[PDB]
Design a protein around this ligand. Sequence first.
Ligand SMILES: CCCCNC(=O)[C@H](C)C[C@H](O)[C@@H]1C[C@H](C)CCCCCCCC(=O)N[C@@H](C)C(=O)N1
Length: 377
Amino acid sequence: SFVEMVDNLRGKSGQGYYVEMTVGSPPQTLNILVDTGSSNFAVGAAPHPFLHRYYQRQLSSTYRDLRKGVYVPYTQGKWEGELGTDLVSIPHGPNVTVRANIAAITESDKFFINGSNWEGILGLAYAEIARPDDSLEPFFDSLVKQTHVPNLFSLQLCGASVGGSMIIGGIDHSLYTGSLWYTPIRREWYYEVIIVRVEINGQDLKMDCKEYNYDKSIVDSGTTNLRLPKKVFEAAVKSIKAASSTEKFPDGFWLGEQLVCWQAGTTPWNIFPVISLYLMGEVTNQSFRITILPQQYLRPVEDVATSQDDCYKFAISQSSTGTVMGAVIMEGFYVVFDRARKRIGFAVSACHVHDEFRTAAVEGPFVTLDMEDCGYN
Ligand SMILES: CCCCNC(=O)[C@H](C)C[C@H](O)[C@@H]1C[C@H](C)CCCCCCCC(=O)N[C@@H](C)C(=O)N1
């Protein structure tokens, strides 16, 4: 019955993917951003200039107050609100209703996005990073505990105004090609993984692999960019600059501050390298790789002035809290969050954006010694 969940995600480029949900009795319809980088379910519950609608607790006969405040800070944006519970369902999801924790957002800062079309957030990671503490059961944990929905979900994020699929409770084999390759979930808090090697156009970065996971490496559908630790970010930019040196860039480009343009249909894709991220595999000394095309990390932006050119922003940015494999990474793949088996699977997506001479790929097996030493402690 997973066909009913195909294409249940929508969004605007760079503003997150959202799924339709209902909260309360009678059901109140809201668009909810799907965020594997957090663990709180929260909805706008008060007027806001960027919200077209919001959760009205007074209108729901099943709302229960928890008499507890909550605050959640993200990499960018934060909100505070009032905790409670209510009945929740997903129209284009499993035919079930659960009572879940809901944070009613009463104040926020740089969280809601003007014209994004979403009014709340669905944190899909584990209780350990839920606020105020890990006793606030996350939505998916409630879903699994109260229903027969199996303990896994998959995300197919399709780039260029954006769409995709969140298959709740399973894997839809019509959505990917080739084989699924699995990497262990290192610890159940974020969806934390271990990167064991990085190559750019086939050349190893030759860094200590701990640098790739310095702090941690996570998979986050709610982050646009590929975010890399300082040292790794500098090495990658140096390599990408060198490969594309024949062209001129405002250099504010490499910081994401300025966009670059080219005459329509003349973008020199060939001069931007592919990036291969090798992930720890399921068996001893085995890994696999996922390869990213420049069409993934050069995010297209509509030039509001002379719509005569193809303009792009550099979607690789520096981090101080570890690697984040955001939408730039996920959009090329079908990603399985196999919570039951503590693993994350990657396969080439059926909605992969590919050029004419290169192809995004998930390839294995590879042999990699001492993968355990790549995790940071
Ligand atoms: C409290 C512990 C959990 C905290 N988790 C996080 O902060 C994760 C890593 C980031 C979240 O996914 C947050 C989620 C944000 C609020 C909402 C999504 C907005 C759409 C895309 C916005 C552009 C973007 O790329 N935002 C990143 C920087 C971001 O902060 N992402």
